């Protein structure tokens, strides 16, 4: 699937059903909702940054070269620009993990529909299933709800293949 769908503004991952009756864009509810739950929890958990406690820390040379100041200075300046870099990495990290998580959900749904349909359809296009037989609106729901049944439409589909075979 190398092309995005603008019409699927309800959820991320969706199916474009096409029957003799018509064509629509139906999002998969469980995939989108579960993914949204996981992504949101990642976001809120990443926020936890738990900076070091405010240990009321400051010193200075005290006119006697008490570099505790330049030590404590570096220590705070060195904790930042290190944690900041480290945090930039964690953002970039989580960014990719969300992106590949998305690609994985795509491929999982495509395998779901392949497993149900099997040889009752042709894999054609960028993730499109051309039904040899006619999947009714209900039948389209059954594939979506995971309740599709191969045998009922099997024989009809088989004869159609043999016609073009």
């Amino acid at each position, epitope marked *: 699937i190398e092309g995005g769908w603008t019409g699927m503004v*309800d*959820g991320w991952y969706g199916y474009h059903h096409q029957n003799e009756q018509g064509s629509g864009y*139906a999002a998969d*509810l469980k995939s*989108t909702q579960n993914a*949204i*739950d996981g*992504i*949101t929890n990642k976001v*809120n958990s990443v926020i936890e940054k738990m900076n070091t406690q405010f240990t009321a820390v400051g010193k200075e040379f005290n006119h006697l070269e008490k570099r505790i100041e330049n030590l404590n200075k570096k220590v705070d300046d060195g904790f930042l620009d290190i944690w900041t870099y480290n945090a930039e990495l964690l953002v970039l990290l989580e960014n990719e993990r969300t992106l590949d998580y998305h690609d994985s959900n795509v491929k999982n749904l495509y395998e779901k529909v392949r497993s149900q349909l099997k040889n009752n359809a042709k894999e054609i296009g960028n993730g499109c299933f051309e039904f040899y037989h006619k999947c009714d609106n209900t039948c389209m729901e059954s594939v979506k709800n995971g309740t599709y049944d191969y045998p009922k439409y099997s024989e009809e589909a088989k004869l159609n293949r043999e016609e073009i075979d």
Partner: antibody
Amino acid sequence: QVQLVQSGAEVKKPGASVKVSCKASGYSFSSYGISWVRQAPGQGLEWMGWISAYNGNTNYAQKLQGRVTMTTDTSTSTAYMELRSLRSDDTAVFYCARDRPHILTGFDFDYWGQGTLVTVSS
Amino acid sequence: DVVMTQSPVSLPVTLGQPASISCRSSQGLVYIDGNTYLNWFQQRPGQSPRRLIYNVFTRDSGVPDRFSGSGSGTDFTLKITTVEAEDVGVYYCMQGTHWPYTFGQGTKLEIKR
């Protein structure tokens, strides 16, 4: 503008189905969703469910999942909440509120309805 | 599941005494959209609930500047300056971004003392 008209007050006995209606207008009904809230007599506000007119995406609250059934008539822009099984504890007033339809988008109970109280005792 | 704890349930005030209502969540309340979601509500007794602050920092069209939603982390607050008389009533936190939507308990106001 703001017009969330709830149904009339309803009185039933335990174990009978109840049907509340919230008819909406005076404001664009562009698939905007509708959620239903319950306030026990002079007690807390408990969210019951949400339905997206854009889709059929119901989210009934775990506590009450089997009994509760929600519907939408886009043509009349009216939502419906139906509690199949009634209880004396369920006796309360019910409230409606608009919600955003897309799960991707957040939520907006911008408009609230007129409280339909429902009494349930034998 | 989400737990909205409302710290100051009982809140008597005197006219013109900015008072605050604290809502504390069990988990962070940010969402994929980007914005947090704690639209505060007010149900003036005898009337149906009303919305105040959209998200965490957005006053509603017909809301007095007195009402002000605040807070960034799990602990959010709502401070109303010049507490007036229609201001009295019950208030609830907003449902968490989690689909478990949680209004939490209520906070009641008094006119004077």
